[PDB]
Scaffold this active site. Sequence first.
Site, PDB file in Angstrom:
ATOM      1  N   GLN A 109      37.914  37.352  40.799  1.00 21.36           N
ATOM      2  CA  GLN A 109      39.304  37.392  40.314  1.00 21.36           C
ATOM      3  C   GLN A 109      40.154  38.407  41.073  1.00 21.36           C
ATOM      4  OE1 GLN A 109      36.555  37.868  38.193  1.00 21.36           O
ATOM      5  NE2 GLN A 109      36.942  36.868  36.228  1.00 21.36           N
ATOM      6  N   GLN A 131      40.738  32.931  43.797  1.00 22.36           N
ATOM      7  CA  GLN A 131      40.446  32.825  42.374  1.00 22.36           C
ATOM      8  C   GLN A 131      41.517  33.582  41.584  1.00 22.36           C
ATOM      9  OE1 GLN A 131      36.422  33.823  41.158  1.00 22.36           O
ATOM     10  NE2 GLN A 131      36.857  33.406  38.982  1.00 22.36           N
ATOM     11  N   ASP A 132      42.124  32.917  40.597  1.00 23.80           N
ATOM     12  CA  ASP A 132      43.105  33.532  39.688  1.00 23.80           C
ATOM     13  C   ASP A 132      44.419  33.925  40.393  1.00 23.80           C
ATOM     14  OD1 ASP A 132      41.061  33.310  37.833  1.00 23.80           O
ATOM     15  OD2 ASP A 132      41.247  35.298  37.009  1.00 23.80           O
ATOM     16  N   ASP A 153      40.570  28.485  39.067  1.00 20.55           N
ATOM     17  CA  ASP A 153      41.457  28.870  37.972  1.00 20.55           C
ATOM     18  C   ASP A 153      42.749  29.465  38.500  1.00 20.55           C
ATOM     19  OD1 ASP A 153      39.240  28.193  36.422  1.00 20.55           O
ATOM     20  OD2 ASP A 153      38.714  30.220  35.896  1.00 20.55           O
ATOM     21  N   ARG A 221      40.015  23.490  33.436  1.00 23.26           N
ATOM     22  CA  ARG A 221      38.893  23.703  32.540  1.00 23.26           C
ATOM     23  C   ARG A 221      39.345  24.638  31.410  1.00 23.26           C
ATOM     24  NH1 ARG A 221      34.492  27.795  35.444  1.00 23.26           N
ATOM     25  NH2 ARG A 221      35.999  29.390  36.093  1.00 23.26           N
TER      26      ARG A 221
END
Lengths: 317, 151
Positions: A109, A131-132, A153, A221
Amino acid sequence: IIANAVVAQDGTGDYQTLAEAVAAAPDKSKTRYVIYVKRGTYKENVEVASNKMNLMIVGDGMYATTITGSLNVVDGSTTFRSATLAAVGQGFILQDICIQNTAGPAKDQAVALRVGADMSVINRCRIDAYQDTLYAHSQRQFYRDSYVTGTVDFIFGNAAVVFQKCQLVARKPGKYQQNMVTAQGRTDPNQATGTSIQFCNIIASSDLEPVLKEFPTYLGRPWKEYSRTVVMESYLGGLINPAGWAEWDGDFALKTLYYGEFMNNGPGAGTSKRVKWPGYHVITDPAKAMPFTVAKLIQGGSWLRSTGVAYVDGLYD
Amino acid sequence: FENHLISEICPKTRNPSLCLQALESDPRSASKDLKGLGQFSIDIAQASAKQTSKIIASLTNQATDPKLKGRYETCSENYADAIDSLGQAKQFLTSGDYNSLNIYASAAFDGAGTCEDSFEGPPNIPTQLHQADLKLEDLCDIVLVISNLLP
């Protein structure tokens, strides 16, 4: 309109760094205050606090002005505090600028932009990480004409948020990773939050396109139990897995999430092999798509009209 | 008679027992309409957030591990935002802007949840803080339920 404060690296402005300009901006301003950031790459972690209201940060173009950082969870930051730029001041507008986090996929993250500012607009921006990438944390947010890229994500949080006419670009992740455009984190069904993606382009980067079969991409998700995400009137590239959506952890959330698709097009838009979760819905009735419009999800007109940004209020382009 | 409105509120929250305890702590409960229960419930939630802000400051003040301190600092920033958002929630309720009330109570709720999410893996969250997060969440949920019942 002319800028109230100019940031520039060549000494031609009022300040050399963005952080200095934000600090000198007025508190609880009742009108829009504009900081213009001239072309350049600014290696800083900037925060726009709750007292810095109605602040507009505008660059020289989304390719020309970049705010960059590399904080990340692997090196000991929290996700929340990893953001290159974080803004919670009501009425925040970000425009013609790139926010990036260069940590990379092996740092897990690592947020480029975090927004927890109500009635905020992100217009013609490029938000770039892995990521993120984009922590649309809370409050009501509108993203328009922007590029958001990431892997795992890459749009996450629990804002009430609409993305309109954005290009949401999944890129090549690390080995064995699976891309997720959204990880919507609504914990509680009494919360009027969720992510709505409308008239967007959901596509692959040039480095992902050759290796689609190795690295799958899902629309989302369920990070939290009442995850709520709708993708409508959008183009979905072939990168989008036939299943459409992915489990978070086995059967967690699958009955209580609400994931919807309405009138999408493109090679990844077919729904005949989608997950069969009770919480997944092929929406055909426009009245069931309407709650996810600018008008209903973010009460947008009551505040968007004074920004000058283009928006579509309802369902159709 | 018990305020009939309590029978519509507490069962819809994630902690009905706590909801009842909180609403019954009002000596003038029976005279309150939905708006009145709303203002009371925001006051309760904000007071909890304010107390927890002090708990976090106290936990920080005895910590030296940089990772743990970073987790507490994140919690602290989130609670500060939650306090601010609940403050604004009062004005929105007064003005009849129930959509904004929901959004701001949702944001406050998520301050506690973001604290919770920041303690994934070691160093583990202190039980005291875990309980304080769940309490703010439960209290903010009373506000959220009332915001959805209001016309």
